[PDB]
Design a protein around this nucleic acid. Structure first.
Ligand SMILES: [Mg+2]
Ligand SMILES: [Mg+2]
Ligand SMILES: [Mg+2]
Ligand SMILES: [Mg+2]
Ligand SMILES: [Mg+2]
Ligand SMILES: [Mg+2]
Ligand SMILES: [Mg+2]
Ligand SMILES: [Mg+2]
Ligand SMILES: [Mg+2]
Ligand SMILES: [Mg+2]
Ligand SMILES: [Mg+2]
Ligand SMILES: [Mg+2]
Ligand SMILES: [Mg+2]
Ligand SMILES: [Mg+2]
Ligand SMILES: [Mg+2]
Ligand SMILES: [Mg+2]
Ligand SMILES: [Mg+2]
Ligand SMILES: [Mg+2]
Ligand SMILES: [Mg+2]
Ligand SMILES: [Mg+2]
Ligand SMILES: [Mg+2]
Ligand SMILES: [Mg+2]
Ligand SMILES: [Mg+2]
Ligand SMILES: [Mg+2]
Ligand SMILES: [Mg+2]
Ligand SMILES: [Mg+2]
Ligand SMILES: [Zn+2]
Lengths: 81, 113, 50, 109
RNA sequence: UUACCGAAUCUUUGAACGCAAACGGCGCAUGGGAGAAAUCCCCGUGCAUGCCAUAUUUCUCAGUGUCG
RNA sequence: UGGUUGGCGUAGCAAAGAUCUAACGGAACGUUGGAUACUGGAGCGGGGAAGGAUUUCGUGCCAACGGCACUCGUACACGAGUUGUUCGGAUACUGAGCACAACGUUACACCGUUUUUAGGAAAAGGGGCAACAGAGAACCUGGGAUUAUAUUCCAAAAAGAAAUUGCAUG
RNA sequence: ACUGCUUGGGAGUGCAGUGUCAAGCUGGCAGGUAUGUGUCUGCCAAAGUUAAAUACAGAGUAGGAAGACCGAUAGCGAACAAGUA
RNA sequence: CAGACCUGAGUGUGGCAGGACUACCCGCCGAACUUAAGCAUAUUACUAAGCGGAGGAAAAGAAAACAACCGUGAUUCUCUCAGUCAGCGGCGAGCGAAGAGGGAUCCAACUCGUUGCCGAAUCGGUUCUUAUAGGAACUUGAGUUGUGGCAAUGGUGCAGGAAUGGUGAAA
C-alpha cells in the first residue's frame, strides 16, 4: 500500500516557515532551516547550486539600505552641515 | 510650510494633534480626498519637529569634549569601512626618520633640455 | 482547526486579501497589460501550506 | 575562612551603570476607523457598543484609554478580535452614562 | 509633477544581540505616558557573547604565587 | 516543441438499494407541502486534533468549474462574519529529548560533552527550550443573542448568579 | 633521517609530520646528479610594509561605447506582475 | 601584616568581532567521471565540491635572485623562451617549466628586531590654545621584563582648476 493509500498516512509537517528565509524549510523537529540553515548565524550557501545562490543573493530583495549607502558613496557622502 | 518651522515645539505639537484628530475623521468619512493632503501635513510637522531635536542635540554635543559622547545616530555615518579605516590624521603619519629624509630630499622639480 | 500562531494568521490574512480580482479601473490605464489576476489562489487547488 | 568545598567568586563592587515624539503609539494610532457594518449597527443601538478597527498591536486597555481620549467616553469593556483579514476589531461597550448612539452620530456615523 | 540629493522617516524581524519563539510571548533596570482606585497599561533607552583598551578624580577584589 | 488528427460521438459516465407528486420559481433544476424510502447512535448524526485557511454567512450569480443538468453549489462576484479575568495556549511544570554558554576537538565548528581544570550567587552544581491528549488550569446557566460567534455576546432589575488575581479601602 | 603530499625538479621542487637539530674564529645559503674535499661566483634566510603595470573565467555600484550576435520554440530561465505561476 | 608585585577575576567605560558578498583573489581541503583503447602509478588536477578569509583587486615584492656574461639586479604582467634534441612519466597516455631577450609598470622603494650611542626623550589620558596638532602644560596611568630618538604638522582663510552636472546654435 505504498502508493495512494499511504499518502493518507502522512499527516504532519516536517517543515514550517522559517523565521529568516520565510521558506517552508524550517525542520520543526530539528529546529533548523534546510534552506537558510537557520538558527546558524551564517546562512546556507553552496557552490554546487549557484542557481540557488543566485536565487537568494543580494539584490534579490529591497536592498533597502544598500541603495542608500550606494547613493552616498557615489556622492562622496556629501552632507549638509 | 516655512510657517511650519517658525512654530515652537509645542506650537507644532498642538498643530500636529489637530491634524491627527482631523486625519482620523476623514477615515471615518472614508468608511461610508483631503486625507492625503492631511497625511502629508502631519509628515511635515514630524519632519520639522524631528529636525529641531537633532538640530538641538548636535547643539548639546557640539565641541570636541563631548563629540566622543555623541549619540551615534547623530555621529557621522559613512560606511563601516570609512569609519574603521585609518584617517589621514593617522594615515599620513611617517616615522621621524622618514619625515627628515623627505625634507632633506624633497621631490625637487626638474626638466631636461 | 483553531490553532494558528498569529504569524500564520497574518499570512493567511495576507494571502486572503491578496486573493482579489484586479480593479476594473486598472485595466483602463494607458499602456496597461494586466487583465486577469495571474495570482488568484483557490483553497481547493493551490495550497498555502502554513 | 572558606566553608564550602568549592570556591565561589567574591562580591566585588559594581558601579551602578531622536524622534521628537518618541512614543509613536498614540490614541490616533490605536483606534483607526469605526466600523459601519450591520453587525456593528446592531450593537450601537442595541448594545451601546461602538465597533472599531483598531491597531492590531493595540491591546484592550489601550483601546479604552483611546476611546476616552478620542471620543471622550468611557468604555465599560472592550473585547477585541483580530479579523481573519488581519485587522483587529474592537467591540467597545460604553458605560450606560454614555450613549453609544449619541456618540456614534456625533462621530459622523 | 518629474528629476536628482544633503535633512530626516525607516514597522516585525534578520549577524540579531535582554530571554525565548509554529508565542506577534516574556523580562530586569532606567525615563516618560495615560490612568487610576497603587495595581494594571502603553512607550523610549539600555541589558547577548568574545575580545582589546581603560578605571585617567586610577573601580572593587581573589591566590597556603613573591615578598614585606 | 506547439497545434491537429483517426479511432469516436466511440469505450464508457453500471460499487453504496429511490424517488414520486402538486404548487411555485425560472427564459427553462431549485423551494414548500405531501408521499416514499434510506442512514440506523462504530450513522451520508453532533463536536475536536492534524490538515486545510474563507471553504463560513447573506445577497447575486451561474461565463468558466461542479465528467449529465442546474434556477442550485465548497464555483463566481459583492458585502459581511470569529467578541473571553475564568475556554485552549502562553505568562508559569516537567518528560523522552534538544542545545546556547563554556570548554574541548577539528586545516575549519556547520562536532562533542551538556555543564565548564570550574571564581557561572548581583540582592554547591551556568542559561534555555521541549506536551493545545501528560502535570497545571478562577464560570455557570438562561436568553426573544446573529444571515454568520458565543461557557466569549446580554446592561443597571447587567437574565443573572459566581469564582478568582492584583492593588487599595474601611 | 623517516614519512606523506607536491613539483618538469629528475640520489628531492616546495611543503608537512615526527625524530634530530646547526653555524656566524676558514660563517651561512644558492650555484638543477648523490658523497667527501678544494677553488670561485651571487647572495645573506628564519621580522615587517609597499603603488603601478595584472585578475574579474556565473560579483556588485554608477554610468558609458559597441556588435558582420539572437530576433519571441531564437537570445538569459525570464522582451510580459520572472526566479514569477 | 598593611600593603607591594605577579597571576587572575568582577563590574563600569570606550571600542571592535561575528553576518552579507565571494566573478576575481589568498589559505587549507580535496574527489571522481574521463584518458591511458583494460587498470592500480599516471591523467583528469595540485581541478570540482567542501572550509576559512580579503580587497577594489588581491597575492607578490626590494634578493640567502639569476647567471657563469662585455655580466644582469624587487615583484606582477606580457611576448617570447617553449609543447621545448630541458625535464617528469606504467619514460606509456601524457605532463612540462626557468634564466636570458623585447615590452608594460616603474621620478619605488622602506620599516623593525639586532648592533652601537643615548635612556622615557615614549605612549595613554586630562587641559589648552578657534586643534582626540607630530604643539603646550599636566598626569603613575602604561612603560625600562624597553617606548623612543640617532648611525650603521595641525587650525584657520581665500581663491582658481579639473570634474561632474545646468544652460545653449543652422536650415
Ligand atoms: Mg516507498
Ligand atoms: Mg506513520
Ligand atoms: Mg486534494
Ligand atoms: Mg496551518
Ligand atoms: Mg480574545
Ligand atoms: Mg532576540
Ligand atoms: Mg456508449
Ligand atoms: Mg433503515
Ligand atoms: Mg455557502
Ligand atoms: Mg471564491
Ligand atoms: Mg531531560
Ligand atoms: Mg515548557
Ligand atoms: Mg493537559
Ligand atoms: Mg485556561
Ligand atoms: Mg455554527
Ligand atoms: Mg602529481
Ligand atoms: Mg638573517
Ligand atoms: Mg525565449
Ligand atoms: Mg565573514
Ligand atoms: Mg580508461
Ligand atoms: Mg571550490
Ligand atoms: Mg598586498
Ligand atoms: Mg605583502
Ligand atoms: Mg628580475
Ligand atoms: Mg600537472
Ligand atoms: Mg625599540
Ligand atoms: Zn529558514
Amino acid at each position: 500500500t505504498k502508493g495512494t493509500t499511504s499518502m493518507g498516512q502522512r499527516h504532519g509537517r516536517t517543515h514550517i516557515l522559517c523565521r529568516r528565509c520565510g521558506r517552508n524549510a524550517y525542520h520543526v523537529q530539528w529546529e533548523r532551516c534546510a534552506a537558510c540553515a537557520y538558527p546558524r548565524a551564517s546562512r546556507r550557501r553552496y557552490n554546487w547550486s549557484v542557481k540557488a545562490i543566485k536565487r537568494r543573493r543580494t539584490g534579490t530583495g529591497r536592498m533597502r539600505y544598500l541603495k542608500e549607502v550606494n547613493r552616498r558613496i557615489k556622492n562622496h557622502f556629501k552632507t549638509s552641515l | 510650510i516655512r510657517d511650519l518651522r517658525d512654530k515652537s515645539k509645542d506650537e507644532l505639537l498642538k498643530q500636529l494633534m489637530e491634524f491627527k484628530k482631523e486625519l482620523s475623521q476623514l477615515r471615518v468619512a472614508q468608511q461610508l480626498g483631503r486625507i492625503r493632503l492631511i497625511r502629508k501635513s502631519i509628515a511635515r510637522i514630524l519632519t520639522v519637529l524631528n529636525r529641531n531635536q537633532r538640530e538641538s542635540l548636535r547643539k548639546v554635543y557640539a565641541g570636541r569634549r563631548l563629540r566622543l559622547a555623541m549619540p551615534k545616530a547623530l555621529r557621522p555615518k559613512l560606511t563601516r569601512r570609512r569609519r574603521l579605516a585609518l584617517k589621514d590624521n593617522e594615515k599620513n603619519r611617517k616615522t621621524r626618520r622618514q619625515l627628515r629624509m623627505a625634507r632633506k630630499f624633497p621631490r625637487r622639480v626638474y626638466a631636461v633640455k | 482547526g483553531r490553532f494558528k500562531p498569529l504569524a500564520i494568521k497574518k499570512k493567511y490574512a495576507k494571502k486572503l486579501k491578496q486573493n482579489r480580482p484586479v480593479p476594473y479601473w486598472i485595466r483602463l490605464r494607458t499602456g496597461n497589460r494586466i487583465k486577469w489576476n495571474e495570482k488568484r489562489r483557490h483553497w481547493r487547488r493551490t495550497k498555502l501550506h502554513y | 575562612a572558606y566553608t564550602r568545598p568549592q570556591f565561589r567568586r567574591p562580591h566585588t563592587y559594581r558601579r551602578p551603570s531622536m524622534s521628537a515624539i518618541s512614543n509613536k503609539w498614540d490614541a490616533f494610532r490605536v483606534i483607526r476607523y469605526p466600523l459601519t457594518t450591520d453587525k456593528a449597527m446592531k450593537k450601537i443601538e442595541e448594545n451601546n457598543t461602538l465597533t472599531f478597527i483598531v491597531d492590531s498591536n493595540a491591546n484592550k486597555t489601550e483601546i479604552k484609554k483611546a476611546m476616552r481620549k478620542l471620543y471622550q467616553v468611557k468604555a465599560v469593556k472592550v473585547n477585541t478580535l483580530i479579523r481573519p483579514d488581519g485587522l483587529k476589531k474592537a467591540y467597545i461597550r460604553l458605560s450606560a452614562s454614555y450613549d453609544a448612539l449619541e456618540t456614534a452620530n456625533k462621530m459622523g456615523l
